[PDB]
């Protein structure tokens, strides 16, 4: 029973799994939180968090493979999948790792600085205390590639396309590709004849099109940045209105790159929390400011779900799917209540059913268009690349 | 016979109406462009370009009184109409301007100090030139003031709206209300149980739902930079992606400020032109920049059309208004083709007919929608409003 390494390296953190290849099942998870900063520690499966202490990306990764040796699974790693963040305009699918993709990843890697470079350092590591093992980049970008111009061009001068690349790429690329999969088939749906709308909600945010199969258009931008709103992040923002702020505030580009990103969105209006559950148990308790922050929360996803029906001849199913989308009743219901111009009815029992239901639609019968839940895995779609491009001859 | 005397202060010019109250019928129209720069001149009805030479707003006002003396109609003035650009959260409907609404203009005006203090400029010197004439202010604002918090707030840190006033705001609304109004009588629909969407395409473009008579969503934002892209105006922009272009070209706030406003948008993407028409040539003699700026201005119109659909209990019309609204065949054809999703058919015998046939439904029979052609009059909204408010006693 052979099994597929899965790293998502963050700015932060590491995350990690161990699927079975044979049945696509975790046997094994955990983080390496806090990462190189004078306090660094990892917890397997949350259950005994040891201590790392101010160590790198190279020994966090030596820390992780300690243990699978101590859970005597080291020799059964055929294959690694590592997450990318950001594959630019040069990769349309998922690859097989080799000198030219790392030059390939070093070269997009200023448009994500943050995350890439992270990226990179777990391919540098991986490498090192793996390398005869066959190794897989997925990206979060690739999926959203089938775009054309009208959907990913900038209303910006040309020449920031063509000497800068200045573009959509769009983002949850490898969990719109795995839930729209599995729409097809919970849908019963021929995919070369389909058109969803995948909303992935969850602390990061962003809408999919797709249209036989094919990302036609996506909520989120260049960067994870533009788009819905989010936990911390604001979402579409009149640029106009930024300039005015900075002109006003004193503050510069720098301060409110850290505003946008870490102090807007669902925290920013609310005041009290990036999470959901507890903005619906303030609004409960008569709190309007979550009230407001959940209802825009709710309006701007209406907006862009509806928004991206466009680019669909025809509209046959909307999905939801990630932390938010999956386990949250009252968003959920919100939001079809607001799509209702689109001929949307809902279940209500259906919709109460908590996530342990998994893959559900939650659409009344005389619905013009199927509502469903759909749980991300993007854990499973790495390891199904990993495990593909793991027949082939290189 | 009595007239009202309509005045727009633009940042570099003066645009007037003569009207008449019985008709509301255009007597004189003329622009006083190139304001108060070192050459300054009147051209009144396109027929005679005279020379103002370095006069500033209050003589220019001056020298479209003298001419509204040479042709005997001063003295029959009753009424004075003056757009507003920026009404701010005070504003909501039109009013009479008194001391009071002088100094609450000026309240706002931070929000537009380009166009509201000239603005200004043009009411101080209507005031003094015309002094017992009953004075109207009408905003481009005011309009969308029904829209629900949800609708305006943005993602952005809470204190931003409370002590900043940063909110959408929305323009065109006078077209947005003149337009929406005529369309209840093409259609045939009951205004308290209706729900349109208003595309205004011009050098400026803007899209409005109207639900049961109201303003419920807009395109544009606190700023006029904010959603469709326009002539020289980018739209929808990433702000990671702008903060990621002034980190890298080494281009300050306000550079971008001014590529944003007037370098990007269908100028941008073409580099060749603001203008629609020579674009609509370019693309037909075989040029791809020109095809791709107008195929992702048609996209991104249809976005915000479908978008702006979800703030509808149901959707009964669709109306084009403004220069590229009104004109191009081509256009509103891409537009509707792109929106086949909300089950619309149109009638391409009447979408060929020219703006001369006035206001005009666009779709065939069996759609679901109904699409049509509403000319703007922004001159008669203003009339409307001042000859309302002529009745009232102040
Ligand atoms: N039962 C629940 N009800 C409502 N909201 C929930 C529930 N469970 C989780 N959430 C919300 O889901 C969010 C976390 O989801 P998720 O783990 O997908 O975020 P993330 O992984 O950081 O983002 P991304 O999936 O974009 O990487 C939190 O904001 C939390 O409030
Ligand atoms: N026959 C036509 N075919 C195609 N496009 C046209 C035609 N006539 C005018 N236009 C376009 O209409 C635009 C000008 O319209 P308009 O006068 O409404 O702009 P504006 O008044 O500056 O903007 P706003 O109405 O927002 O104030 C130009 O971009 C022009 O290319």
């Not at 094994?28 to 990306?57: Q, R």
């Not at 301060?255 to 303030?282: F, M, Q």
């Not at 919709?351 to 993007?378: D, F, L, M, W, Y």
Request: with cysteine; aromatic share 6%; charged share 20%.
């Amino acid at each position: 029973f052979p099994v597929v390494l899965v790293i998502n390296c963050g700015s932060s953190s590491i995350k990690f799994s161990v699927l079975d290849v044979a049945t696509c099942d975790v046997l094994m998870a955990g983080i390496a939180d806090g990462m190189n900063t004078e306090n660094a520690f990892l917890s397997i499966n949350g259950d005994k968090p040891i201590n790392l202490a101010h160590s790198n990306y190279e020994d966090a990764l030596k820390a992780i493979a300690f243990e699978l040796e101590k859970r005597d699974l080291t020799d059964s790693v055929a294959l690694i999948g590592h997450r990318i963040a950001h594959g630019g305009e040069l990769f349309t699918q998922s690859v097989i790792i080799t000198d030219e993709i790392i030059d390939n990843i070093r070269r997009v890697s200023p448009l994500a600085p943050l995350h890439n470079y992270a990226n990179l350092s777990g391919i540098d590591a991986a490498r090192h205390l793996f390398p005869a093992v066959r190794q897989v980049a997925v990206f979060d970008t690739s999926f959203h590639q089938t775009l054309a111009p009208e959907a990913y061009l900038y209303g910006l001068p040309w020449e920031y396309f063509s000497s800068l690349g200045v573009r959509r790429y769009g983002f949850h690329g490898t969990s719109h590709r795995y839930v729209s999969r599995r729409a097809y088939e919970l849908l019963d749906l021929d995919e070369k004849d389909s058109g969803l709308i995948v909303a992935h909600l969850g602390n990061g945010a962003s809408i999919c099109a797709v249209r036989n199969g094919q990302s036609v258009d996506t909520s989120m931008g260049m960067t994870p940045l533009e788009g819905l709103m989010m936990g911390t992040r604001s979402g579409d923002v009149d640029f106009g209105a930024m300039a005015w702020i900075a002109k006003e505030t004193g503050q510069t580009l720098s301060d409110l790159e850290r505003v946008v990103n870490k102090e807007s969105g669902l925290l920013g209006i609310s005041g009290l929390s990036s999470d959901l559950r507890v903005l619906e148990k303030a609004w409960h308790e008569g709190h309007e400011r979550a009230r407001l922050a959940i209802k825009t929360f709710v309006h701007r996803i209406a907006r862009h779900i509806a928004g991206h029906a466009a680019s669909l001849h025809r509209l046959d199913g909307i999905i939801f799917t990630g932390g938010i989308g999956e386990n949250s009743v009252l968003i959920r219901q919100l939001v079809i209540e607001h799509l209702g111009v689109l001929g949307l009815t809902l279940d209500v029992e259906m919709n109460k059913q908590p996530n342990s239901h998994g893959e559900r639609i939650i659409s009344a019968n005389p619905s013009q268009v199927i509502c469903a839940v759909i749980p991300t895995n993007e854990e499973k779609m790495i390891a199904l690349d990993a495990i593909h491009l793991g027949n082939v001859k290189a």
